[PDB]
Ligand binder design. Structure first.
Ligand SMILES: COC(=O)Nc1ccc2c(c1)NC(=O)CCCCC[C@H](NC(=O)/C=C/c1cc(Cl)ccc1-n1cnnn1)c1nc-2c[nH]1
Length: 238
């Protein structure tokens, strides 16, 4: 996260840190708890991931230093990548992790509501991007979960900012015209959480941008409301 501040413990209890153990253990991506065995994240996080066996989901984490060999985690039973996914820049950047065990909900770990299809018209004015990602292009994973408040950008304005790309309505952009606050390397897969009528909604999934927090380069997020039926197809299968 660029231009953010330290989160307080329990502030984003749906935020997870997804680690890979191959070749050595390290933070891979962010993710959000959306159900008691379900993590919603970005499809591009699994580039070169040949098996769910190398993955570890840690919930209830503020600081990466809380993670040692004796720290509990959730194993991943299955990686579900959207069928139409090719690359982050072309959209469909969405994946589900089916956990091997159930998350016990509490004040440190609980789900974020998916947006309502009826709320496709609501204007969100209180949106935050969170993660342990870089503070600038050449940096390192941060110990403490960071947060940054960022305004949503219309599809038309985002398309003007990304000449040469096709910014679809399945993408949602967020950023200041002057830059300064954004997601960066290591934040992808994490949530873009917006508070509406005292309820937090998972509006976006951190996907991509040209550089980090650059002037007139909003961050591009998977527009979660456009995938609610896809999520229900995968999580509510008979
Ligand atoms: C010690 O542990 C570490 O250093 N871990 C460790 C360290 C670094 C990384 C990973 C692990 N994860 C991966 O590479 C998995 C594969 C994932 C690829 C892509 C991923 N992108 C982002 O996270 C966000 C991009 C992004 C998103 C928005 Cl909305 C705006 C601007 C963005 N940026 C443009 N340029 N940079 N950011 C990324 N993540 C890293 C590099 N790149």
């Amino acid at each position: 996260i660029v231009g953010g501040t330290a989160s307080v413990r329990g502030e984003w209890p749906w935020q997870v840190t997804l680690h890979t153990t191959s070749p050595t253990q390290r933070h891979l991506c962010g993710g959000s708890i959306i159900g008691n065995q379900w993590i919603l994240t970005a499809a591009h996080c699994f580039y070169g991931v040949e098996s769910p066996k190398i993955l570890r989901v840690y919930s209830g984490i503020l600081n990466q230093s809380e993670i040692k060999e004796d720290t509990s985690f959730f194993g991943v039973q299955e990686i579900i990548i959207h069928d139409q996914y090719k690359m982050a820049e072309s959209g469909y950047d969405i994946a589900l992790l089916k956990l091997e065990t159930t998350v016990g909900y509490g004040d440190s770990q609980r789900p974020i509501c998916l947006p309502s299809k009826g709320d496709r018209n609501v204007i969100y004015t209180d949106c935050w991007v969170t993660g342990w990602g870089y503070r600038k292009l050449r940096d390192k994973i941060q110990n403490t979960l960071q947060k940054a408040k960022i305004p949503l950008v219309t599809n038309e304005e985002c398309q003007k900012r990304y000449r040469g790309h096709k910014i679809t309505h399945k993408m949602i952009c967020a950023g200041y015209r002057e830059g300064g606050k954004d997601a960066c390397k290591g934040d992808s897969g994490g949530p873009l959480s917006c508070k509406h009528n005292e309820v937090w909604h998972l509006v976006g999934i951190t996907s991509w941008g040209e550089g980090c927090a650059q002037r007139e380069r909003p961050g591009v997020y998977t527009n979660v409301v456009e995938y609610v039926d896809w999520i229900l197809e995968k999580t509510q299968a008979v």
